[PDB]
Design a protein around this ligand. Structure first.
Ligand SMILES: O=C1Nc2ccccc2C[C@]12CCCN2
Length: 150
């Protein structure tokens, strides 16, 4: 009973979370997951500020109201070569990664590793936070509040 969460640097508090190495998070699971990090789904303006501080990914993820990819450098296989906060318009499917926003994080780029999941609750799952530099933090718990996500 294991969940792997890959997390990025934070940019003005905004960060990306990928679950189990594939697009696997529903909109309800995304909110619960950010809540486990004492975080919320970013607003579009919080995401635009993060982008301006250096944030970019090549993965779709939820924000409040939309599914997006923040892009700085044009890349033909990331958001069809677009720059800015790219908004997904048409998709058949419902599961993506997520973005989260922690208001207590530093104001600009924070590429230190994440060593805690402070607001998870009691549960049976081994949850492992995986940083890009390979450092890991694990704890037994749960963060999903909707049965249809479990
Ligand atoms: O592909 C990856 N992306 C990533 C992004 C952020 C955090 C943790 C990871 C895991 C890593 C790097 C090494 C192999 N898997």
């Amino acid at each position: 009973n294991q969940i792997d969460l890959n997390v990025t640097c934070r940019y003005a508090g905004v960060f990306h979370v990928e679950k189990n190495g594939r697009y696997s998070i529903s909109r309800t699971e995304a909110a619960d997951l950010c809540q486990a990090f004492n975080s919320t789904l970013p607003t579009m303006d919080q995401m635009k500020l993060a982008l301006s501080k250096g944030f970019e990914t090549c993965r779709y993820g939820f924000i409040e109201g939309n599914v997006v990819i923040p892009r700085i450098h044009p890349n033909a296989i990331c958001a069809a070569n677009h720059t800015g906060v790219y908004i997904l318009v048409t998709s058949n499917t419902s599961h993506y990664d997520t973005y989260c926003f922690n208001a207590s994080a530093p104001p600009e780029e924070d590429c230190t590793s994440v060593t805690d999941l402070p607001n998870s609750f009691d549960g049976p799952v081994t949850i492992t936070i995986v940083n890009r530099d390979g450092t890991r933090y694990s704890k037994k718990g749960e963060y999903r509040t909707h049965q249809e996500d479990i």
